[PDB]
Amino acid sequence: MEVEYTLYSFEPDPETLFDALLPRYIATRVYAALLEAAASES
Amino acid sequence: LDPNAIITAGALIGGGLIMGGGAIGAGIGDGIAGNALISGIARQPEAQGRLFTPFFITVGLVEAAYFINLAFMALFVFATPGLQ
């Protein structure tokens, strides 16, 4: 993924949350692609 | 060996001890409460108004003791109990 350019309280730490969120972000984008492809197919 | 000399020596030692202890307590407590306040403000500027209410409470509990020390300390040196 390319990078495009109050303070939130991240727990346990920002890095662990980022690492957990990235795979779920990729899965979400895959799911969105699947939904949009199904709509295009219909 | 005058007795009042010993009286004054003991009173001054005790007063110095109380003043030092009160200084330690006040300094540490004020520093810790200030650390809490600074971190809280850093996380969210809006809270600056709110945090003073609890923060100022803590100082009141702390400084009181310190200002009590001085008071009781003033008792020993200026009017030493048991002095003749």
UniProtKB/Swiss-Prot annotation, chain A:
Extract the signal peptide range. none
Query: Where does this polypeptide localize?
Result: Cell membrane
Subunit: F-type ATPases have 2 components, CF(1) - the catalytic core - and CF(0) - the membrane proton channel. CF(1) has five subunits: alpha(3), beta(3), gamma(1), delta(1), epsilon(1). CF(0) has three main subunits: a, b and c.
Q: Which family does it belong to?
A: Belongs to the ATPase gamma chain family.
User: Per its database record, what is this protein's job?
Assistant: Produces ATP from ADP in the presence of a proton gradient across the membrane. The gamma chain is believed to be important in regulating ATPase activity and the flow of protons through the CF(0) complex.
List the protein's name: ATP synthase gamma chain
Q: Which residues of the full protein are shown?
A: 206 to 256 of 307
